[PDB]
Design an enzyme around this catalytic site. Structure first.
Site, short mmCIF file in Angstrom:
data_model
loop_
_atom_site.label_atom_id
_atom_site.label_comp_id
_atom_site.label_asym_id
_atom_site.label_seq_id
_atom_site.Cartn_x
_atom_site.Cartn_y
_atom_site.Cartn_z
N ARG A 189 0.80 -1.22 0.00
CA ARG A 189 0.00 0.00 0.00
C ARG A 189 0.83 1.26 0.00
NH1 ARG A 189 -2.74 0.65 6.17
NH2 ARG A 189 -0.79 1.42 7.12
N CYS A 215 -0.16 5.42 1.24
CA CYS A 215 -1.15 6.31 1.83
C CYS A 215 -0.62 7.73 1.78
CB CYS A 215 -1.45 5.87 3.27
SG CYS A 215 -1.66 4.08 3.48
#
Lengths: 124, 124, 124
Positions: free
Chosen positions: C101, C103
């Site tokens: 991921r 962010c």
């Protein structure tokens, strides 16, 4: 599919992995200027960019990929004014191999990092 | 893996390629309202978005892909208030073929562009 | 290649699909905290994030994927100070599987959403 873990990049602290291999492709998590021991580099933008690349090299190699097999990068930067400096460092790593890229200035990055880079790379 | 080069989009000057073909997929770099000769388009948001799509068309076609084979787009916009206008033009190119997309307002784009769009496409 | 359509997430309104299947991979559109009927979810950031995950669940399952086969996520957040709350909810769905991921805090999201999440997943 499988998770990639290496001690030569900062530990994935939370519900994510440093990267994932799916088919013959490696997806990295975005890397920021943390050392493997987990503290922020406090030199200039170029020093911070080098650390991001050290972390990327570690996760790429653990995945069986390299800078030479990166297909696409996204570069998130804190200040677009610093693009020239980030780009000078960036080009040392993507010298003869030149991935597709997008670069944008976000509002804020994790730990107020000045630069964050994610990559997608082929696993030969 | 193969780099994509076309004179019908702005030249990739620096450590990136206009796009990359890997396996049977094409990844573009993010395209901005820049002419192939390297001038920023200074008309309205629609004229600028049209230039982004001209650039995307060129790189897609050089890669053996098309708008009809785009699977995913990311739209980075300087101001969400202009998104409806960007979307009007976007919808002329992706009218019956409708890729996945994510759209976000960034703080700033390269060359202070009003919009930047990257695509991933199938090479049939 | 196939567009993904489910009535258990907000409808894709305009020139995009909730997601696309290509080869053995699924690309979602970025999901915001809308209900399937098209209203922004009532409540705090945790409630909004739960709705984003309900929407992702719906599109993943329709595509023949699941949270267990997600390879890469991107979390776009309106305020990084709310990330701990987003991450707590995130971890409830990515518990048995931890994708790659990134962010980042963006300037603004569609409909002034507090969070938007996109995924890429394997179709088994």
């Amino acid at each position: 599919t499988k998770a990639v873990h290496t001690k030569h990049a900062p530990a994935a602290i939370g519900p994510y992995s440093q990267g994932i291999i799916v088919n013959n492709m490696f997806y990295s998590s975005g890397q920021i200027p943390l050392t493997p021991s987990g503290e922020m580099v406090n030199g200039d933008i170029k020093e911070q960019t080098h650390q991001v690349f050290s972390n990327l090299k570690a996760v790429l190699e653990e995945a069986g990929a390299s800078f030479e097999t990166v297909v696409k990068a996204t570069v998130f930067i804190a200040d677009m004014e610093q693009f020239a400096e980030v780009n000078e460092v960036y080009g040392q790593y993507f010298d003869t191999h030149k991935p597709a890229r997008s670069c944008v200035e976000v509002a804020r990055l994790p730990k107020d990092a000045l630069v964050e880079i994610e990559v997608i790379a082929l696993v030969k």
